[PDB]
Amino acid sequence: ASKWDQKGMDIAYEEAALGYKEGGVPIGGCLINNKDGSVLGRGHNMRFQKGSATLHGEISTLENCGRLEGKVYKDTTLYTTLSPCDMCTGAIIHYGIPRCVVGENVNFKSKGEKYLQTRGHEVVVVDDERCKKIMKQFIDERPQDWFEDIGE
Amino acid sequence: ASKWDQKGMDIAYEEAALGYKEGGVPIGGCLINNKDGSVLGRGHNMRFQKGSATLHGEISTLENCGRLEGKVYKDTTLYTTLSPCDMCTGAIIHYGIPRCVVGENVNFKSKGEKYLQTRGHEVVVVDDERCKKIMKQFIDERPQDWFEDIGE
Ligand SMILES: [Zn+2]
Ligand SMILES: [Zn+2]
Ligand SMILES: [Zn+2]
Ligand SMILES: [Zn+2]
């Protein structure tokens, strides 16, 4: 089940780092087919890049996969550098993506992490230090922007 | 509490009808400030228009409101022509939008409708037959497209 998890989190981290370089929030993701390891799409938070309230890393990832038949999502893993908010949790549930692998849940965690599990989805938190470090750097440099991004 | 609800559902329906005319799925929305009735944004499903897997009517509506401080969402109502999926439910929860007014829940309903309420959001289903009729027309004419849109 975990065969592609290093590949997936490496891509998600690359997306976070790219977003950071663009002036955005360093949250990245990708969607991988569990059978063959192919990458259906990858993305990062586009709040700053696009003035976007909805393009979280996870949402941008799914957008970048394009229109798909519903069946395609059912044997994928969504990789995200940060534990998903209620909206991104809802996307995973809506599309029936069975597995979500999370870089870290230290800098952010919503009720969504547990809700995924109650709705029958697998959540794996890998506690990736690279993810924790880049996210903490953003929180330390741009706390007001982070507060906007979390929507409180 | 319901002062702006006719206005809001009228705008949501206009957005659904516009989307229908553009060749898309007839689901529309708007976000209104509860105090003064001002429209923060309005939108419709953009699957066909933009090849979008994530721009549901509710998501498009929120995107069209732009970047906002989190406090702005806390005294709004989101109007949608159709009862929200788990992703759109999650967006409402994430941003703390206290009220969701729904055109109809006959053509579609998710576990989100009830989840909204247990998470502390008011859900009002007005059973607007304009919404029900246009949505059913789309489902009747384009069942394959509908199936794709709901992620099944
Ligand atoms: Zn997130
Ligand atoms: Zn999110
Ligand atoms: Zn919907
Ligand atoms: Zn939706």
Author numbering:
A (entry chain B), B (entry chain A): 7 to 158
Paper text:
Cytosine deaminases (CD) catalyze the hydrolytic deamination reaction of cytosine to uracil, and are found only in prokaryotes and fungi, but not mammalian cells. Utilization of yeast cytosine deaminase (yCD) to activate the prodrug 5-fluorocytosine (5-FC) to 5-fluorouracil (5-FU) at the target site is an attractive strategy for overcoming the narrow therapeutic index of 5-FU. Structural studies of yCD have shown that its active site contains a tightly bound zinc ion critical for catalytic activity, and is coordinated by His62 and two cysteine residues Cys91 and Cys94, and a hydroxyl group bridged to a second tetrahedrally coordinated zinc bound by three water molecules. Nevertheless, protein delivery of yCD is challenging in part due to its thermal instability.
A close examination of the structure identified a methionine residue, M100, located at the entry of this cavity, which we surmised could be replaced with a bulkier residue to provide steric hindrance to block any incoming O2. Herein, we have rationally engineered a mutant yCD by replacing Met100 situated at the active site entry with the bulkier histidine to hinder potential oxidation of the active site Cys91. To obtain structural confirmation for this observation, we proceeded to determine the structure of yCD-M100H protein by X-ray crystallography. B Structure of a yCD-M100H active site consisting two Zn2+ ions, one of which is coordinated by the active site residues, His62, Cys91, and Cys94, as well as a presumed hydroxide which bridges to the second zinc whose remaining tetrahedral coordination is filled by water molecules. The histidine mutation does not affect the active site conformation nor the interaction of the catalytic Zn2+ ion with the active site ligands. In concurrence with our hypothesis, the histidine substitution indeed provides more coverage for the active site residue Cys91 along with the Zn2+ ion. The more rigid and bulkier side chain of histidine significantly reduces the solvent-accessible surface exposure area of Cys91, thereby protecting it from getting oxidized. The two enzymes share similar conformations except for the C-terminal helices, which are shifted away from the active site in yCD-M100H. Mutant yCD-M100H was significantly more active than its wild-type counterpart, exhibiting a much lower Km and higher kcat values than the wild-type’s. Furthermore, this amino acid substitution of methionine with histidine was able to enhance the yeast CD’s thermostability by 10 °C (Tm = 60.69 °C), which was comparable to that achieved by the triple mutant yCD-TM (Tm = 59.30 °C), whose mutations have also been reported to improve yCD’s thermostability.
